[PDB]
Design a protein around this ligand. Structure first.
Ligand SMILES: Nc1ncnc2c1ncn2[C@@H]1O[C@H](COP(=O)(O)OP(=O)(O)NP(=O)(O)O)[C@@H](O)[C@H]1O
Ligand SMILES: Nc1ncnc2c1ncn2[C@@H]1O[C@H](COP(=O)(O)OP(=O)(O)NP(=O)(O)O)[C@@H](O)[C@H]1O
Ligand SMILES: [Mg+2]
Ligand SMILES: [Mg+2]
Lengths: 154, 469, 56, 462, 30
């Protein structure tokens, strides 16, 4: 009842799932249940809506396929279905960010990104430019330009 | 200087006294009356005080049937706790909870010294602690949870798993040849078993070194609590004033706490989570804190607790773990596999499972067995849904062994001879520690699935397999 | 190779036919556990509520 | 010894006055209904009504019976269907019984009991052959609805004419259609001339449903204490537990798990500990009880099934998946046990066919996985088929053990499965004209006859 | 020389083991 009563007044809510806390991909914001009044064409524009909707829909689609994988196996599913996982893993990993106030817990100074680079980077990750970079390279990075460096580091 | 009865609510009686004559807690009250008119009934009754509720009244709990209590009758206060005989005169005899003989063989006069039931637990300057093994010959118990002399051993099981079978097996294997005084308190069990063991003891000549009191199911809620205390007040004397080692057996001590839940709702208390009395922990502590060893002797007690269902999260059995020194757990789901005894290997533990007290060759095999069984427990869902053939070769090899270990945990008891074509067999500790080594290194693992059921030593397994072809 | 490829599909048919069964038993028993958990939760909630109401 | 009633709420009443009233006493209202006292406060008495309370008003006069919960007993109740309060149901005049028993009497205890070595002939093959019963034992009948529990009790009570055991049948919370069907069956077969039937239907108030088994056992033990043997059956304990929950919740007691109060283990014990086999201080008689428990979903782990198991000495759990499989009665070779040893059965049974339980349970598990095992499977179908029987066909115990001997010795391996049940009906037509002596030998010596002659008998039929 | 053939992916049941085991045994025995 307390969250149910609180949910009626917010204009934008971001939810945190302890599963994401245990996965080691911070912050723990779950994209599925996070919604806002700003996602309208007259406020964010058309360059925002299509990419956000595609990423949201892909992350919703992966949720049940990953559970099917837990029993049916890993190659019994078709290759086209496996591509959904192959790209959703990268999409979810790239959501992590190296913060500036977490320097005590991370030991790192962080990085900075503007919104233009965020929409731009998601467009590239859906474009297929980064299929061959390892997933673990996307953990706790900021601007997309850092990723190719971390792979260079590896 | 006499009391009255004004309110009756079943097990609870609300006696009343006059100024200055208020009884203390656990005091005993007596009521006697003879029929004044043909419409009345003759009953002699005794009561135990539990609460003081002001206005010159005290709450008391009845020790016998309360039918026919007319209001306005007289009450007698003894001024002392309930007194039960103790000492040499109590060997071989049988009493009820009030302490009188129920074996009909004779009386016990007042020259036998009798003590109060309730006394405070010993101080820290009187207690002692030592660790040494008590042995039973059971394969499953002696390895993964050896017992400690003077400690507490707990048995946990549902509404029928074989608790009484284990208790009687232990008695047949230890109590006669241990050399110590034995007390068996028949708390809350079936009356048929209570009168069966009386024959079992008298015709076998062991009754000369045993004391018993009974509180079986038929008795009102007030009596079912104090059977354990009346059993313990004799073992205490046998330990202290005679310097004898004492074994105490209790079967349904849980019927203590349940009895409280029956009476608390009538005493006038607020209910607990699931309706228990809000005194479960303190009263159970006041009960089990007197079963202790001292510097003068040791008391070893084996007890069983009735789990109200297949749910160990229930507060009454869950809060028992604060006192046990060795734990044995039973469950229906292993009993139904055809394996007896169905002791769970991953929930029975003991303080004596340490490497300086049992040796390296014991601790190593115990830890290896537990580790090997954990993986097979974890593989449960996936082997159940799709099959044992899914897993890899290194997992298939592991699957080949855990069920054989579980089968090897089975053994034929001595009281099972009436249900099985073989009598009970004995496997010493040095043999039960040895046995698992052969299976773990693959010396005998290739035998078929059913040969390890109902076997003694590891040599009998191979001859049973040969008898199977 | 043709005989083996036919026996392969036969074995797969059998594997799915065994696999499809235990699911229904597992669902029915979990659903029973679900109703029992429900009933226990509601009973506990009403007992607490009525105890509070009687106290106050 | 006067007063007034001031509350008439929901079948429970409160009364003023009544200075001399005792606990457990019977009470009568001026309307003509019986009630009882269970609680006595500082200035009022709580009364539980045992009939139709719609006629009670405030200010009604209420009166003292002057004695504890006594129910009449004796031979005059034989041949009648009676109310638990002691009133005939089908008319036929008032009862002539003089002696009475308090139904709250203290049960016999230590130095008054003895072991069990003699069977209770039931005539249902699958029970006596696998889960034996003896006099003094308390056997739980528990299981699902719409599977045929009552059809076991009826057959068991019809078979008792040859053992001369006065018996009582108790119906609780039940529909009158089945009650009168059972009564008509008993009167047709004649069982009513020595059995006593007590009923308390679903249209009756809860307190009658709560008290019915106490009267059913009090009118039964009286013949025990005089040396006779008695069998007592209860139609359903689940309904009695529900009625007690109803009464307790009207009385405002704190509910426990599933709202069932903590007295459940107490209430049933004070009912089920009355069964005993008396010592020589009273007589050699014995009483056996068959209480019934209905499971809401067929799950054993519930509260009432386990609490009722805790008192009884065994149980047979009747299943529903067996009901639609073409097998009646639904008896499971697995989780169903009796604690009495094999010696209770006649010595031939333990001698030869005691392996039936293993032979059947092993097959019942092995079929799930399904040369040596191929041969083993062939026997199980015959092991289940021979145990089958139809309605109202109680086989004599001598022929019963003879056919069990024929089954266990492998005489039937040639007979096809679908024809097995034919052999069983034709085989008894053979022996009465060729092996009449073996029946009398079995009846007299309680032991198996000569093995050579018994083996020679069968080849003539085959 | 020996030829052994198996299924190409999982959920095939006991098809895979029963042939690999027998081929392996019959070769290393001799
Ligand atoms: N070695 C064994 N082999 C086969 N069955 C066994 C064995 N030991 C015990 N049992 C069974 O286990 C059942 C439980 O025994 P029993 O002690 O009478 O019940 P319980 O667990 O004590 N329940 P309760 O005493 O009322 O709290 C017995 O009735 C036997 O059928
Ligand atoms: N052993 C049997 N063989 C053949 N038919 C049977 C058998 N037992 C019962 N039946 C039939 O099945 C019906 C159901 O039996 P019945 O004894 O009324 O079940 P029940 O115990 O009353 N079920 P419930 O009312 O929920 O307790 C009977 O009326 C018979 O027609
Ligand atoms: Mg037992
Ligand atoms: Mg019925």
């Amino acid at each position: 009842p307390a969250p149910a009563t609180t949910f009626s007044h917010l204009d934008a809510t971001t939810n945190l799932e302890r599963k994401l806390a245990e996965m080691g991909i911070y912050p723990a914001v779950d994209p599925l249940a996070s919604t806002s009044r700003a996602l309208a064409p007259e406020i964010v524009g058309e360059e925002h809506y299509q990419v956000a909707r595609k990423v949201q829909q892909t992350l919703q689609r992966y949720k049940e396929l990953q559970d099917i994988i837990a029993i049916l196996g890993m190659d019994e599913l078709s290759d086209e279905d496996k591509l959904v996982v192959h790209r959703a893993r990268r999409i979810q990993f790239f959501l992590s960010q190296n913060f500036h106030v977490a320097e005590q817990f991370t030991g790192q100074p962080g990085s900075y990104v503007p919104v233009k680079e965020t929409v731009r980077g998601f467009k590239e990750i859906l474009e297929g430019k980064y299929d061959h970079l390892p997933e673990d390279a996307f953990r706790l990075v900021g601007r997309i330009e850092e990723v190719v460096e971390k792979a260079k580091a590896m | 200087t006499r009391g009255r009865v004004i309110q009756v609510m079943g097990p609870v009686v609300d006696v009343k006294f006059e100024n200055g004559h208020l009884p203390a807690i656990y005091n005993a009250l007596k009521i006697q009356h003879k029929a004044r008119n043909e419409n009345e009934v003759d009953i002699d009754l005794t009561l135990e005080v539990a609460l003081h509720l002001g206005d010159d009244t005290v709450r008391t709990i009845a020790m016998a049937s309360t039918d026919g209590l007319i209001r306005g009758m007289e009450v007698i206060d003894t001024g002392a706790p309930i007194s039960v005989p103790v000492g040499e005169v109590t060997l071989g005899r049988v009493f009820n909870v009030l302490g009188e003989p129920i074996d009909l063989e004779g009386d016990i006069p007042a020259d036998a010294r009798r003590d109060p039931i309730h006394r405070p637990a010993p101080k820290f300057e009187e207690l002692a602690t030592e660790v040494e093994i008590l042995e039973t010959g059971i394969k499953v118990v002696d390895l993964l949870a050896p017992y400690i002399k003077g400690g507490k051993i707990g048995l946990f099981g549902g509404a029928g798993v074989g608790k009484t079978v284990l208790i009687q097996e232990l008695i047949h294997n230890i109590a006669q040849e241990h050399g110590g005084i034995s007390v068996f308190a028949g708390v809350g069990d079936r009356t048929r078993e209570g009168n069966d063991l009386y024959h079992e003891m008298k015709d076998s000549g062991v009754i000369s070194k045993t004391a018993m009191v009974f509180g079986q199911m038929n008795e009102p809620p007030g009596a079912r609590m104090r059977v354990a205390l009346t059993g313990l007040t004799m073992a205490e004397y046998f330990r202290d004033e005679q310097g004898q080692d004492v074994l105490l057996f209790i079967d349904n001590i849980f019927r203590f706490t349940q009895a409280g839940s029956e009476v608390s709702a009538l005493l006038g208390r607020m209910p607990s989570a699931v309706g228990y009395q809000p005194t479960l922990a303190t009263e159970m502590g006041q009960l089990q804190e007197r079963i202790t060893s001292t510097a003068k002797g040791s008391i070893t007690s084996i007890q069983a607790i009735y789990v109200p269902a297949d749910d160990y999260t229930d507060p009454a059995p869950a809060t028992t773990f604060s006192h046990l020194d060795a734990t044995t757990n039973l469950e229906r789901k292993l009993a139904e596999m055809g394996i007896y005894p169905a002791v769970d290997p991953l929930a029975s533990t003991s303080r004596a499972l340490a490497p300086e007290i049992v040796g390296e060759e014991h601790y190593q095999v115990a830890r290896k067995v537990q580790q090997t069984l954990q993986r097979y427990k974890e593989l449960q869902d996936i082997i159940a849904i799709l099959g044992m053939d899914e897993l890899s070769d290194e997992d298939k090899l592991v699957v080949h062994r855990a069920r054989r270990i579980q089968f090897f945990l089975s053994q034929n008891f001595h009281v099972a001879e009436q249900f099985t074509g073989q009598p009970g067999s004995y496997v010493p500790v040095k043999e039960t520690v040895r046995g698992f080594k052969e299976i773990l290194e693959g010396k005998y693992d290739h035998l078929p699935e059913d040969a390890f059921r109902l076997v003694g030593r590891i040599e009998e397994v191979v001859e049973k397999a040969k008898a199977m072809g | 190779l043709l005989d083996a490829k036919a026996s392969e599909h036969a074995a797969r048919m059998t594997a799915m036919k065994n696999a499809t069964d235990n699911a229904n038993e597992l669902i029915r028993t979990l659903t029973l556990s679900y109703n029992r958990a429900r009933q226990a939760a509601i009973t506990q909630e009403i007992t607490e509520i009525v105890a509070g109401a009687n106290a106050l | 010894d006067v007063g007034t009633v001031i509350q008439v709420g929901d079948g429970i009443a409160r009364a003023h006055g009544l200075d001399n009233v005792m606990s457990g006493e019977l009470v009568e209202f001026a309307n003509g209904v019986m009630g009882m006292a269970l609680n006595l406060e500082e200035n009022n008495v709580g009364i539980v009504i045992l009939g139709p309370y719609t006629g009670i008003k405030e200010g009604d006069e209420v009166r003292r019976t002057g004695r504890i919960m006594e129910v009449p007993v004796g031979e005059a109740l034989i041949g009648r269907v009676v109310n638990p309060l002691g009133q005939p149901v089908d008319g036929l005049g008032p009862v002539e019984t003089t002696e009475t028993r308090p139904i709250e009497s203290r049960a016999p205890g230590v130095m008054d009991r003895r072991s069990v070595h003699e069977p209770l002939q039931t005539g249902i093959k699958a029970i006596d052959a696998l889960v034996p019963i003896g006099r003094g034992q308390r056997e739980l009948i528990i299981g699902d609805r719409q599977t045929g529990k009552t059809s076991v009790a009826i057959d068991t009570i019809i078979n008792q004419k040859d053992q001369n055991m006065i018996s009582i049948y108790v119906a609780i919370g039940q529909k009158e259609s089945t009650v009168r069907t059972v009564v008509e069956t008993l009167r047709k077969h004649g069982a009513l001339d020595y059995t006593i039937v007590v009923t308390a239907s679903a249209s009756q108030p809860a307190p009658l449903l709560f008290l019915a088994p106490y009267a059913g056992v009090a009118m039964g033990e009286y013949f025990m204490y005089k040396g006779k043997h008695v069998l007592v059956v209860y139609d359903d304990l689940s309904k009695q537990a529900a009625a007690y929950r109803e009464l307790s919740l009207l009385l405002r007691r704190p509910p426990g798990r599933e709202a069932y109060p903590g007295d459940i283990f107490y209430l049933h014990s004070r009912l089920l500990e009355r069964a005993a086999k008396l010592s020589d201080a009273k007589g050699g008689g014995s009483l056996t009880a068959l209480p019934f428990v209905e499971t809401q979903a067929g799950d054993i782990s519930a509260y009432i099934p386990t609490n009722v198991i805790s008192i009884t000495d065994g149980q047979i759990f009747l299943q529903s998946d067996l009901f639609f499989s073409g097998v009646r009665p639904a008896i499971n070779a697995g989780l169903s046990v009796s604690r009495v040893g094999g010696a209770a059965q006649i010595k031939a049974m333990k001698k030869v066919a005691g392996t039936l339980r293993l032979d059947l349970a092993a097959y019942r598990e092995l079929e799930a996985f399904a040369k040596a095992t191929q041969a083993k499977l062939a026997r199980g179908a015959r092991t289940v088929e021979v145990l089958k029987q139809d309605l109202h066909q109680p086989i004599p115990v001598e022929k019963q053990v003879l056919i069990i001997y024929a089954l266990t010795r492998g005489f039937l391996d040639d007979i096809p499965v679908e024809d097995v049940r034919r052999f069983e009906k034709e085989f008894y037509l053979f022996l009465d004209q060729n092996g009449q002596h073996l029946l009398e030998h079995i009846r007299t010596t309680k032991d198996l006859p000569n093995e050579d002659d018994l083996n020679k008998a069968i080849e003539a039929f085959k | 020389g020996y030829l052994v053939i198996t299924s190409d992916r999982g959920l095939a049941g006991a098809y895979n083991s029963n042939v690999l085991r027998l081929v392996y045994q019959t070769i290393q025995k001799r």
